[PDB]
Design a protein around this ligand. Sequence first.
Ligand code: FYD
Ligand code: FYD
Lengths: 164, 165
Amino acid sequence: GFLELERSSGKLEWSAILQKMASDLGFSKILFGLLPKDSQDYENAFIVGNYPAAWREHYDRAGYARVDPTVSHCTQSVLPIFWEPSIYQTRKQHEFFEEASAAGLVYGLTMPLHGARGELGALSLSVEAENRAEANRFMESVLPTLWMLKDYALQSGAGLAFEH
Amino acid sequence: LVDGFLELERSSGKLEWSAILQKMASDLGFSKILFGLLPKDSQDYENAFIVGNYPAAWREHYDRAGYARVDPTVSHCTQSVLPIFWEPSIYQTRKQHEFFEEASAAGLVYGLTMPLHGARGELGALSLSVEAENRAEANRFMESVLPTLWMLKDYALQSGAGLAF
Ligand SMILES: COc1ccccc1C(=O)Oc1c(Br)cc(Br)cc1CNC(=O)c1ccccc1[N+](=O)[O-]
Ligand SMILES: COc1ccccc1C(=O)Oc1c(Br)cc(Br)cc1CNC(=O)c1ccccc1[N+](=O)[O-]
């Protein structure tokens, strides 16, 4: 639980616990990103997780926070956004989909994080699967548990990220 | 839920939105609800956007007694995205004990409050009361529906922000 996240000491232990919870839910890859109130500085977000480091670096270098459609979505909504063909509309967004798929990140969802002190973030989780249909079933069967998890991760994470 | 969300989105205005949300809560097992929402950087609880079916006299009293300064769920909501259950432990001060007695007298004895923190800085709460024989039976019931309610509150927030502002 959150209890586990709260008792942990430091960022390494907290990332290992979150990765495990997410793995227990069927997601082998995650990225928890968090910004303080009023910040839009995506290249200096507090980040936890196990996305391939080269993909994280590429995301930063290419400035993909400008193109990633889950980014504009999180600024407008508290609801999850599933990684579906229909969210990638522009040339640049299709390149995005293609580079992210080359990293293994093809199916998944992004849960926006909106903290009590105005923190802005996302918990993105990717699921390994044969097609869209299978990925959807796996994501749907755990969605109530993920929906709680994202809020526990935010409440715990905000303190990890910003309390020094 | 997603059906409910679209119904909320497709609703005509506050009256139909309130009726839909009330019934979602009722179908899930909760008798009374209160959905409250403030815009970014407001602490004017007396003039929040409010939906629901708490007794009118109770709502009036809460406003006249300045209970937004007392109600322990209000401080809680400004500090967390996690639910606060209406446990004896949350009423710490003398004034909070009086608050509990008055809410209880209104029928509002067991329940929980889900903080709402919107994408544009909206601050709110979805509070739901449950009718039950005693606390242990209420808590059993709340634990069985909590994952559904957790989803519900975010749907209600996102739609409600759209209606209110
Ligand atoms: C504070 O942080 C944020 C705040 C509001 C929103 C996002 C965030 C964030 O964390 O954004 C990032 C950052 Br920064 C780096 C990387 Br790498 C990835 C993301 C988020 N996007 C994805 O994970 C995504 C989404 C869809 C398909 C594939 C992917 N994917 O990347 O594979
Ligand atoms: C924008 O609105 C808000 C914004 C951030 C937080 C709360 C709110 C809100 O809606 O606060 C209110 C308001 Br305003 C009026 C009334 Br009446 C009730 C509440 C909420 N409190 C309860 O429902 C509650 C809680 C525990 C025991 C009994 C009760 N109870 O009242 O029976």
